[PDB]
Structures are given as structure tokens and as C-alpha cells.
Amino acid sequence: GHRTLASTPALWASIPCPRSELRLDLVLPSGQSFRWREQSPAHWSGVLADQVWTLTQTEEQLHCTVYRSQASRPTPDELEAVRKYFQLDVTLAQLYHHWGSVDSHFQEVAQKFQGVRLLRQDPIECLFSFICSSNNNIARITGMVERLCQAFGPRLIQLDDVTYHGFPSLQALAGPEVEAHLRKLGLGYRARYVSASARAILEEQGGLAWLQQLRESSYEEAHKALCILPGVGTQVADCICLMALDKPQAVPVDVHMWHIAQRDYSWHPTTSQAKGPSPQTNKELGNFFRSLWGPYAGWAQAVLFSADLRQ
DNA sequence: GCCTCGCAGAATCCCGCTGCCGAGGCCGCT
DNA sequence: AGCGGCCTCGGCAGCGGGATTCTGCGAGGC
């Protein structure tokens, strides 16, 4: 079973994270990832780097525990791994103050919202998780990615309901027949969007090196490089850039963002000739959000997304 | 004696949207 | 002067499971 606060008191790891800077219940199930579930209150669990992670939040600290194989006191290198995963070197209070000074709508939204953060995931993990998250509700994608991880991932242990697996290796998905096999599992057409976006990594773009060299490249170059891949449009390209490549200038634009804009901000496509999902409208909204907010507008977008979901 | 209220069961919407199909702009050369 | 076709636009629609939202059916009792 998933570890509870009274399960194994010597199997935790505390890191400094105030509740004003971050809130677990508003970030992880808020579309940004699809490998974390809740069983007990204020608990989350998902596999990263072939290791099961369980996260909970106290008033001023974040508590962590791991499943691998029979050892406690997780090593500080994984603490730095989750620190990079959670942008703990970044401060959000000053960013909230900046946004409230420039625009009072974000302050009114954040009058009860304190700490909608963003993550920084592995690009293979985040990319393949967000392939099958297009035109799809969160719970379906969560079960969807869990079933894919069961089918193609190295399992760890059956933890009282369902086995947990490492996220599938890139050699496991770049083969043939995988589209039909995952369509049997129920990925929909996204299965094709996985297959065409697996071999293209290793057979036509240059392997894992081409993708891993994009974490220090320029914005538009990396954006177009991800957009060339099949199934990775501008929304998931910006999602990968923001949550796997450390590009805080990127604002994801989706159904929630556009409903929020058209109902709260009175923004309409000026240069564009329509009001429907389109790359020009996405670029216009990105430029507008960057100009009105600044260089870190994706984080304010994340707060807006968490506000949209819990309402 | 039929019509208000409940009530179970289909229909449709929806959800963190890309690939392909219409379309102007830019070149093309009669 | 005459219209063919490359290149980023705009509009859906493909894939499932859960909510709404309609959509017809029993009891009734004024």
C-alpha cells in the first residue's frame, strides 16, 4: 500500500517548501502530469527515473518517500532531482506580487490560491505522457498512461492494488506493430501519434542526443523542433518546453485558457480573423500574455488553469 | 382521469487538440 | 491577363469514459 504518515516514520525525507509557495492538491492533477493518483488524503504517487515517488505536504515542508529496494533515507542526489522537478530554487511569492501589482485579476484569483507551481520533468517521460493528452480529460489520460506504463514498462512492485512500472524505454516504442498493440490497449488515434513520434526520435532526428540537447537551446528553434514531430502541436510543444526544457516564456493555450480569456479578460483575436483554436491565435495569446505579465507568464497560466479546474 | 413529480435510461458534450482539408499571398507566363 | 500550386492561416474530428441534459414511463388525487 501507499505509505501513510503513520506507516513508516523513519522512511521520509523533508525538504523546505512553504504552503504559500506550493500546494500539492492544485498542481499535480491539474493536467501537467498524468502519472499521479490519490488514495489517502493529501497524498500523491508516481514513478520517475524508475523509482516510485510519494509526495505529501505539511504546513511549511514537503515530505517525500521512495519505493525501489529495502533501504531508507533516500540519497541527496534524488533530492536534487526532485528539487529540479519542483523548481525549488525559484520563488513564486515575488512573482505573485509582480502580477498583483500589474493586474488585479490574478490577485483576485490568488486571493485563495497560493502556490500553483510548475514541474520540470524528463523530456521522454513528459513528451510521451503529453502525446496521449490531446483532446482528452485528465482522468482518462491518467489511467491511459498508467495502462501504457503497465504494458511497456519495467514493473517495480504490486503495491496493494496495481503494479508500478518504470516509464517505457525509447527502444520499446520505436518498433513496428506498436500502434495496433496500443490501440488494443485503448490509446485511440494517439497510439499512432505515439508510434510516429517514437521511431522519428531514433531513426530520423538523431536519437536521444537531439532531444536532450534542446534543454539549453533557443526558444523558437526548440519549439519548431518539437513541432516537426508527429502529434506534437503548439500546445504540447509549449507544454514540453515549459515542463521539461525550462522555458518559462511559454504559455500553454487550451480550452481552459480560452474560456478563461473570453469570459474574464475580454481578449479576442485582433490580427487573426476567427476565434477558434489555431496557431495564429495561440501566438497572439502568447504575445499578449507575455506583454501583460512578463517572461514567466506560464506560471500565472498554471495558476489560472488550477483556478479553472476547481470551479 | 389526466397530468406534476419522480425516475431510469439514452444522446450529446466534453475533455489540457493535431492532421488534413479549404484559403489568401506569392511566384508563374501566358 | 491568367491562372496553377507551395506556405502558414482557420475548422473540425478522430478515440473513450464520465457527466449533464434531454426523453420517455409509473403513481397519483385533486
Numbering used by the authors: 12 to 79, 83 to 325
Kindly provide excerpts from the paper associated with this entry.
The human glycosylase OGG1 extrudes and excises the oxidized DNA base 8-oxoguanine (8-oxoG) to initiate base excision repair and plays important roles in many pathological conditions such as cancer, inflammation, and neurodegenerative diseases. Human OGG1 contains an AlkA_N-like domain and a helix-hairpin-helix (HhH-GPD) motif55. Here we report cryo-EM structures of human OGG1 bound to a 35-bp long DNA containing an 8-oxoG within an unmethylated Cp-8-oxoG dinucleotide as well as to a nucleosome with an 8-oxoG at super-helical location (SHL)-5. The most predominant oxidative damage to DNA is the oxidation of guanine (G) into 7,8-dihydro-8-oxoguanine (8-oxoG).
We introduced an 8-oxoG at the center (-C16-p-8-oxoG17-) of a 35-bp GC-rich DNA duplex and mixed the purified protein and this DNA fragment at a molar ratio of 1.5:1 to assemble the OGG1–DNA complex. We obtained a cryo-EM 3D map of the complex at 3.6 Å average resolution. The 8-oxoG base is fully flipped from the DNA helix and inserted deeply into the enzyme active pocket. This model of interaction and 8-oxoG flipping are similar to the previously reported crystal structures.
